[PDB]
Design an enzyme around this catalytic site. Structure first.
Site, PDB file in Angstrom:
ATOM      1  N   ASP A 259       0.824  -1.199   0.000  1.00  0.00           N
ATOM      2  CA  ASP A 259       0.000   0.000   0.000  1.00  0.00           C
ATOM      3  C   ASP A 259       0.862   1.255   0.000  1.00  0.00           C
ATOM      4  O   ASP A 259       2.007   1.234   0.453  1.00  0.00           O
ATOM      5  CB  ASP A 259      -0.947   0.017   1.199  1.00  0.00           C
ATOM      6  CG  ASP A 259      -0.218   0.160   2.520  1.00  0.00           C
ATOM      7  OD1 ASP A 259       0.761  -0.580   2.744  1.00  0.00           O
ATOM      8  OD2 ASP A 259      -0.620   1.019   3.334  1.00  0.00           O
TER       9      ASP A 259
ATOM     10  N   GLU B 218       0.153  -0.815   5.971  1.00  0.00           N
ATOM     11  CA  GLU B 218       1.228  -0.470   6.893  1.00  0.00           C
ATOM     12  C   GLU B 218       1.127   1.008   7.255  1.00  0.00           C
ATOM     13  O   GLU B 218       1.429   1.409   8.379  1.00  0.00           O
ATOM     14  CB  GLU B 218       2.591  -0.787   6.270  1.00  0.00           C
ATOM     15  CG  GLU B 218       3.778  -0.610   7.216  1.00  0.00           C
ATOM     16  CD  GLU B 218       4.213   0.838   7.385  1.00  0.00           C
ATOM     17  OE1 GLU B 218       3.995   1.649   6.460  1.00  0.00           O
ATOM     18  OE2 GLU B 218       4.775   1.162   8.452  1.00  0.00           O
TER      19      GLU B 218
HETATM   20 ZN   LIG Z   1       6.920   1.806   4.174  1.00  0.00          ZN
END
Ligand SMILES: [Zn+2]
Ligand SMILES: [Zn+2]
Ligand SMILES: [Zn+2]
Lengths: 376, 372
Positions: free
Chosen positions: A69, A134
């Protein structure tokens, strides 16, 4: 010079995988690594996609950890080239995720491909732990993959998190740990009243003043060979009704600790309370901890990474624990040794994010060298 | 009587700076007994200089017709602009601050005039429609006009509420000056995980803040308490708890006696900031200087009129906020303040003791009898 890494990086960057959307990036990676004996296990939670790819069944297990992501592009009009159309320009590859961290993923994948071709009968196992969240709250991300792996005793011996760690040149810095984060929301209480009758009031700014100074001047710890001293910083302070002839009834203060392994939650909290209390401050102090510090001491893994970088890049890598944090704070619970290693983090989360073109084959060669030193 | 003329004034919704023809009312009722009217309207504000007579000594009642807002009117037991006598108390905005005091003096002038049509000196009224506000077009400009033609005052009684518990237990013979500061401490914004690349204005200011809060500015004197320093507002941050702010705003105020000066206090604050290496902008504003009428003739007649009328000994004071006396004193030999209990000014359900109105009017009378 190998160009597989660059080509794959462009392919990954082409997919607008804004958090937590994966845009079939993990599907792409699975199908490619399947060609060289990686079995795939989907671990989807909520709207977050995770995948655990693994070649081999025996230890030592070497794991690459990363996320597919990316953070939002920001004002698209400020970009010199479209953030999701990777472009080569002035010796650099521009695109969202070019540095954080799709390039690292591409580099490791091609490293596995070259390594396996040279050492089909390598010992141990190679694995990838990829998440699609994340940059967000990451509740359904790596932390749950780790919990699943921990529960079934599928532990890692060496983990490399592909976050960008370089200051300037690739390989000049390795992260062998990170600080924790302890935030505090303080509301000092006084008593509101007209500013001309102070004796009939309690100014929370006055009462807090001596404690404020002591807090800002406090030495919490001396750090160590891996960590800088624990750092205290005030982010917000607010008190007053806007009126210039009124003493406020309360004062709000928001502060934060980025603390090393030389400090703990409890130790910092009790000391902050002791400072407030001994100065006679009345307050509501509410606490919040978004992450704990983790550390891998200098050893086999850090020496190996440093050696691979020396051979490939021709520079002496330094160890570090500075900056923000990473999913390494979750993975360390099942990884005996863990480092982070990637390209420059100078342009991360910014407009015109990029990475040096020459740094891409280098990073892939560094990853391959690490695999060779651990599994061959 | 004063009860009625008061009730008549409070019924007007004269929130600052709107007068609602309060000054026209007073001009009308007093023209009957020799008071000539003079309108001095500036910008938003309405002022009137009512005067009877043309010779010294000049006794002047100063006050304001405007009143602060009422707040949520769904909280008043009885609506603020419809007077109500309940539980031995008048309820209404302006009852204490300060329409009652105006009503008391007006009736006191009437009764006094009825007893002494041949009184010496001159009675005057300096009324403004902006005392609670910024007061830039209020009393200060009227005083400026009077000073510009040498129309001076001997005794001035500002009808602000002064009493603590019962009427006449305290009178003000002076007030502290007011000096406000707007401080903007400069730092450098940045991510909180990289403090060495930033400058936290809260941290750089902390040592200066403490020294300022601990500073003894002066010891006051026989008339004033020590100069007082206070922070009113402090605001810094972007809202993000992982960001070091780029600037910090701090608002503070001095209530200072004659023991300190405006320039002196300014310099001392700068010295404290500078010696701690604080980088800053600092905007000053002084809304008033200290002033003092020493104990004597005007204070003596007040305690006398209050002793006879109320039966309590009045103490002199200089504490609290300030008044328009900080402008008028420049033109009035002796100046005091005298009114009902200020225990409920600017508050929901403002009120006054019913018995103190005729009493307060008798005191204004008593003071009028003893000077004129
Ligand atoms: Zn990263
Ligand atoms: Zn008033
Ligand atoms: Zn007032």
């Amino acid at each position: 010079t190998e160009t597989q890494s660059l080509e794959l990086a462009k392919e990954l960057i082409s997919r607008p995988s804004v958090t937590p959307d994966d845009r079939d990036c993990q599907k792409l990676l699975a199908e490619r690594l399947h060609k060289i004996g990686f079995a795939a296990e989907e671990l989807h939670f909520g709207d977050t996609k995770n995948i655990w790819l693994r070649r081999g069944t025996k230890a030592p297990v070497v794991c690459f950890a990363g996320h597919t992501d990316v953070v939002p592009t920001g004002p698209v009009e400020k970009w010199d080239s479209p953030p999701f159309e990777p472009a080569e320009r002035d010796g650099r590859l521009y695109g969202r995720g070019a540095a954080d961290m799709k390039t690292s993923i591409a580099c490791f994948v091609t490293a596995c491909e070259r390594f396996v071709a040279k050492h089909p009968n390598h010992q141990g196992s190679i694995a990838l732990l990829i998440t699609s969240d994340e940059e967000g709250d990451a509740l359904d991300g790596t932390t749950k993959v780790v919990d699943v792996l921990k529960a079934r005793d599928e532990l890692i011996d060496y983990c490399i998190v592909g976050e960008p760690t370089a200051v300037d040149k690739l390989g000049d810095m390795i992260k062998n740990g990170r600080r924790g984060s302890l935030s505090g929301n303080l509301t000092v209480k006084g008593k509101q009243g007209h500013i001309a009758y102070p004796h009939l009031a309690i100014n929370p700014v006055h009462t807090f003043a001596p404690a404020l100074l002591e807090l800002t001047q406090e030495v919490w710890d001396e750090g160590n060979e891996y960590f800088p001293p624990t750092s205290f910083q005030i982010s917000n302070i607010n008190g007053g009704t806007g009126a210039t002839n009124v003493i406020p009834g309360e004062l709000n203060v928001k502060f934060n600790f980025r603390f090393s392994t030389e400090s703990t939650e409890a130790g910092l909290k009790q000391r902050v309370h002791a400072i407030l209390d001994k100065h006679g401050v009345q307050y509501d102090l509410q606490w919040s901890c978004s992450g704990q510090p983790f550390l891998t001491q200098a050893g086999k893994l850090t020496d190996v990474a440093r050696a691979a970088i020396a051979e490939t890049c021709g520079i002496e890598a330094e160890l570090s624990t500075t900056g923000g944090t990473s999913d390494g704070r979750f993975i360390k619970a099942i990884a005996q040794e863990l480092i982070e290693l990637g390209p420059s983090n100078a342009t991360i989360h910014q407009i015109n994010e990029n990475v040096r073109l020459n740094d891409i084959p280098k990073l892939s060669a560094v990853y391959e060298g690490i695999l060779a030193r651990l599994l061959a």
